[PDB]
Design a protein around this ligand. Structure first.
Ligand SMILES: *[C@@H]1O[C@H](CO)[C@@H](O)[C@H](O)[C@H]1NC(C)=O
Ligand SMILES: [Mg+2]
Ligand SMILES: [Mg+2]
Ligand code: NA
Ligand code: NA
Length: 330
């Protein structure tokens, strides 16, 4: 089957920066693989560029993409973060800083219980301390849950608007890993997930005129039955997989790449939006970008590290891999 990717993103009248970022992704997709790393948000200012800095010093280059998370921007008991000047702009500033260097900010949001009854994003089937927040109620106009999600969406939109007004575009990967049902937003299944996606897409893109976002739908794991979870081609720019292989296994994950091509009819760029061990760079499974998780998933620890020093040196010097030093500047 042929690829059939749009040269423009789904946002009408995308910002100049979003145009440039999307075009960069389309032009490099299938020819090069964009390096990435997640960082840990919270009360540690030094940590904010830990993983990229380690990569610069150890492997000779910063990743082209940096991962940031709004998880503390809202939530029960999170005032220490969102009301402290040291942290309330941590995500915006990290994204601005990386964009200004020519890199790609990739934002997500482990969205804490919008009711504020708990501080949890994990669902009752996750095995972890959970929220009871009901996605099916959140998508119905005029419920308490609907009011709550719209309050939180306004806060995050304010942050994204700060980025928009600074000329920054981002990969935006909301409502991620929905099909695992371990987060409240996927816990009620595909119907609520798609209705949530639409509420957020319309609020951000139409109501708030956030035209600076490249929308990433996380398709698994688990991937089985993901077609029924898909928000549609008009609400998604990139298909991302979150695949955590055995620790130390750099298999390319070819089969998942192929499934994403098939399931979505070749219409969207396919990326490895989270991983542990990074898939070996390989143009037979040419993930648009990869992003290991933070701490030991990136910086090696122990005798069987997720991504060894040797692996990183090789990867960051590969002609297949785009590092921050290969970026054109926005
Ligand atoms: C390609 O994608 C466009 C937009 O989704 C669609 O109109 C068309 O049917 C697709 N297939 C082909 C073969 O162009
Ligand atoms: Mg539709
Ligand atoms: Mg090979
Ligand atoms: Na799976
Ligand atoms: Na090592």
């Amino acid at each position: 089957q042929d690829w059939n990717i749009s040269s423009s993103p789904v946002t009408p009248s995308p910002s100049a920066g979003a145009q440039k970022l999307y075009s960069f992704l389309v032009q490099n997709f299938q020819k090069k693989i964009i390096s990435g790393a997640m960082t840990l948000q919270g009360g540690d200012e030094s940590a904010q560029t830990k993983e990229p800095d380690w990569l610069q010093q150890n492997a000779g280059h910063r990743p082209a993409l940096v991962g940031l998370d709004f998880m503390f921007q809202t939530g029960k008991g999170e005032e220490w973060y969102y009301n402290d000047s040291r942290f309330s702009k941590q995500v915006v500033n990290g994204a601005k800083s990386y964009w200004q260097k020519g890199g790609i900010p990739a934002l997500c949001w482990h969205w804490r219980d919008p009711s504020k009854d708990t501080d949890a994003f994990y669902s009752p089937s996750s095995g972890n301390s959970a929220t009871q927040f009901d996605a099916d109620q959140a998508v119905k106009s005029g419920t308490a849950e609907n009011k709550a999600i719209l309050q939180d969406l306004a806060v995050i939109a304010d942050q994204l608007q700060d980025l928009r007004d600074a000329g920054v575009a981002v990969l935006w990967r909301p409502l991620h890993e929905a099909s695992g049902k371990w987060f409240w937003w996927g816990y009620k299944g595909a119907d609520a997930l798609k209705k949530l996606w639409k509420i957020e897409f319309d609020y951000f893109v139409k109501e708030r005129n956030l035209n600076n976002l490249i929308w990433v739908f996380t398709a698994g794991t688990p991937i089985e039955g993901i077609a029924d979870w898909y928000p549609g081609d008009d609400m998604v720019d990139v298909i991302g997989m979150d695949i955590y292989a055995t620790q130390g296994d750099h298999a390319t994950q070819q089969d998942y790449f192929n499934q994403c091509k098939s399931i979505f009819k070749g219409r969207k760029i396919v990326a490895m939006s989270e991983c542990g061990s990074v898939p070996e760079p390989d143009l037979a499974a040419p993930w648009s970008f990869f992003m290991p998780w933070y701490n030991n998933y990136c910086i090696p620890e122990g005798s069987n590290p997720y991504n060894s020093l040797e692996f990183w040196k090789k990867t960051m010097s590969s002609s297949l891999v785009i590092t921050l030093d290969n970026m054109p500047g926005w």
